[PDB]
Write an enzyme that holds these catalytic residues in place. Sequence first.
Site, short mmCIF file in Angstrom:
data_model
loop_
_atom_site.label_atom_id
_atom_site.label_comp_id
_atom_site.label_asym_id
_atom_site.label_seq_id
_atom_site.Cartn_x
_atom_site.Cartn_y
_atom_site.Cartn_z
N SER A 20 0.68 -1.35 0.18
CA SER A 20 0.25 -0.20 -0.28
C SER A 20 1.20 1.05 0.39
CB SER A 20 -0.62 -0.03 1.50
OG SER A 20 -1.50 1.48 1.80
N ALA A 22 0.95 6.00 -1.29
CA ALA A 22 0.21 7.17 -2.14
C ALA A 22 -0.35 6.54 -3.74
CB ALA A 22 1.71 8.21 -1.37
N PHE A 23 0.72 5.74 -3.94
CA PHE A 23 0.29 5.48 -5.34
C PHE A 23 -0.99 4.57 -5.22
CE2 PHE A 23 1.81 1.86 -3.65
CZ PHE A 23 0.96 0.58 -4.34
N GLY A 24 -1.47 4.22 -4.55
CA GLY A 24 -1.96 3.34 -4.47
C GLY A 24 -2.10 2.07 -3.54
N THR A 25 -2.54 1.22 -4.36
CA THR A 25 -2.44 -0.22 -3.54
C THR A 25 -2.47 -1.35 -4.46
OG1 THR A 25 -4.64 0.29 -1.36
CG2 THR A 25 -3.64 -2.20 -2.51
N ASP A 137 12.84 6.73 -9.86
CA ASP A 137 12.76 5.68 -8.48
C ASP A 137 13.19 4.79 -8.56
OD1 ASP A 137 11.90 5.75 -5.55
OD2 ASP A 137 9.71 5.05 -6.28
N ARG A 141 14.01 -1.96 -3.05
CA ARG A 141 11.97 -2.03 -3.30
C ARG A 141 12.09 -2.16 -4.83
NH1 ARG A 141 12.91 2.99 -1.24
NH2 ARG A 141 12.02 4.58 -2.94
N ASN A 142 11.93 -1.60 -5.85
CA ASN A 142 11.47 -1.66 -7.09
C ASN A 142 12.35 -2.70 -8.18
OD1 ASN A 142 9.70 -0.54 -6.29
ND2 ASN A 142 11.20 1.79 -6.96
N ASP A 155 7.98 0.26 -11.28
CA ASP A 155 7.24 1.17 -10.80
C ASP A 155 8.37 2.53 -11.35
OD1 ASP A 155 5.93 2.45 -8.48
OD2 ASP A 155 7.19 2.16 -6.60
C1 LIG Z 1 9.43 -4.84 -1.77
C2 LIG Z 1 8.19 -5.23 -1.55
C3 LIG Z 1 7.70 -6.53 -2.91
O1 LIG Z 1 8.00 -5.92 -3.83
N1 LIG Z 1 7.02 -7.43 -2.32
C4 LIG Z 1 6.09 -8.45 -2.78
C5 LIG Z 1 6.74 -8.60 -3.64
C6 LIG Z 1 5.87 -9.53 -4.41
N2 LIG Z 1 5.14 -9.75 -5.68
C7 LIG Z 1 5.26 -9.14 -7.20
N3 LIG Z 1 5.33 -8.87 -8.03
C8 LIG Z 1 4.89 -7.89 -9.21
C9 LIG Z 1 5.06 -7.12 -8.57
C10 LIG Z 1 4.47 -6.84 -7.19
C11 LIG Z 1 4.85 -5.36 -6.45
C12 LIG Z 1 4.52 -5.31 -5.75
N4 LIG Z 1 4.02 -3.77 -5.50
C13 LIG Z 1 3.59 -3.24 -3.93
C14 LIG Z 1 4.06 -3.24 -6.87
C15 LIG Z 1 4.12 -1.19 -7.01
C16 LIG Z 1 5.07 -1.57 -7.96
C17 LIG Z 1 4.74 -1.96 -9.43
C18 LIG Z 1 5.08 -3.63 -8.76
C19 LIG Z 1 4.93 -3.97 -7.57
N5 LIG Z 1 5.02 -7.74 -6.92
C20 LIG Z 1 5.51 -11.02 -4.17
O2 LIG Z 1 5.01 -12.19 -4.98
C21 LIG Z 1 4.04 -12.25 -3.99
C22 LIG Z 1 5.58 -10.52 -3.05
C23 LIG Z 1 6.04 -9.91 -1.80
N6 LIG Z 1 6.64 -10.08 -0.45
C24 LIG Z 1 7.30 -10.31 -0.04
C25 LIG Z 1 5.59 -9.73 0.72
C26 LIG Z 1 5.73 -9.85 2.16
N7 LIG Z 1 6.33 -8.40 1.78
C27 LIG Z 1 5.37 -6.91 1.14
C28 LIG Z 1 6.62 -7.91 2.62
#
Ligand SMILES: */C=C\C(=O)Nc1cc(Nc2nccc(-c3cn(C)c4ccccc34)n2)c(OC)cc1N(C)CCN(C)C
Length: 289
Positions: A20, A22-25, A137, A141-142, A155
């Site tokens: 979650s 500011a960008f959104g969810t 960015d 984390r990205n 991102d």
């Molecule tokens: C650095 C945190 C993280 O991304 N954790 C994460 C990610 C994934 N898989 C996944 N796959 C595709 C895209 C994304 C993703 C997540 N976010 C917040 C995004 C923002 C912008 C663009 C893309 C994004 N994430 C995943 O797969 C199950 C698990 C996971 N974790 C590690 C869950 C637990 N952490 C959040 C603590």
Amino acid sequence: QALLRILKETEFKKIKVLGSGAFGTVYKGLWIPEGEKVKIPVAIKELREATSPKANKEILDEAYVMASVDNPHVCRLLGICLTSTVQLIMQLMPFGCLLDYVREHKDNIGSQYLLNWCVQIAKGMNYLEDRRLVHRDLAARNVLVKTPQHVKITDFGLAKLLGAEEKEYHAEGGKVPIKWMALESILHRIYTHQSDVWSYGVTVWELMTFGSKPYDGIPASEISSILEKGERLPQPPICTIDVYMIMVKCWMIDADSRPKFRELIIEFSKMARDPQRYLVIQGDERMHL
Ligand SMILES: */C=C\C(=O)Nc1cc(Nc2nccc(-c3cn(C)c4ccccc34)n2)c(OC)cc1N(C)CCN(C)C
Ligand SMILES: C=CC(=O)Nc1cc(Nc2nccc(-c3cn(C)c4ccccc34)n2)c(OC)cc1N(C)CCN(C)C
Ligand SMILES: C=CC(=O)Nc1cc(Nc2nccc(-c3cn(C)c4ccccc34)n2)c(OC)cc1N(C)CCN(C)C
Ligand SMILES: [Cl-]
Ligand SMILES: [Cl-]
Ligand SMILES: [Cl-]
């Protein structure tokens, strides 16, 4: 312009929220394309509502830039869903982002993976540069792990063309963390490929420290002064001086004296051939000749 795939909210559901902001969810979910048996796990980024017509014109720009990039180290769009709110649908990366990954596995990661990741991230950024895109960015984390051998940038919400006018939709969001930003970005809101090279520096540092917070426990207001003094992030323990030298060039105050991504590709490829020479990790074993 491009043709994007448009999906019905019925084609998929959101199981849980990965994240979650500011960008959104962004949610984890499952996607069954119509007329197909196969079930596909997806990440679903529900954007924040725009608060101005101009931002309302721009809120989809993110999806078009993401759809226009074709490179193994850059994440791709599967499609958008517009039914009520804007949602970008992408492939789930079950290994998650690199930042978490190196934290979960700080005891089990060899030098060859760390240096290969640096190569892959630099390759993707060099691609984005060839396309005149500034990410703005880049951070551990990205970067997401498709596999130990494969990592991808992501991102694109803040991404822009070089020299472009700042978008009204970017300004209605929260601010970038100062601790990844170049000094010129911080002082004057200038952004370039060379400001991205700085954030690559911090990203490498994050990986080489197995996920430590840059400038931990310091206020973001002090950061600009620190940088002006000349202070920089410390050499990570596992790094030889050759590796740290590269990070430190990424943080030079003259942007045009920082390395180019194409140079970072060459340097880190060289090290990834002989990794134990450039990174010293306990439990990392090189077979005897
Ligand atoms: C650095 C945190 C993280 O991304 N954790 C994460 C990610 C994934 N898989 C996944 N796959 C595709 C895209 C994304 C993703 C997540 N976010 C917040 C995004 C923002 C912008 C663009 C893309 C994004 N994430 C995943 O797969 C199950 C698990 C996971 N974790 C590690 C869950 C637990 N952490 C959040 C603590
Ligand atoms: C994306 C948000 C948006 O456009 N909101 C909006 C628009 C109008 N009508 C209108 N007509 C011309 C311009 C504008 C306008 C709205 N905002 C926020 C602007 C900022 C800078 C310049 C112009 C504008 N607004 C308007 O006139 C009654 C009211 C609202 N709202 C505040 C709607 C409520 N909420 C959805 C924000
Ligand atoms: C042309 C000036 C203008 O639109 N200014 C404006 C407005 C708003 N908020 C807002 N909210 C609802 C409607 C409007 C609105 C603005 N205009 C021009 C309208 C014309 C018809 C009907 C509605 C509107 N504007 C707003 O945020 C809440 C910000 C600004 N500005 C950024 C100032 C822009 N100004 C310097 C031209
Ligand atoms: Cl290759
Ligand atoms: Cl070589
Ligand atoms: Cl050689």
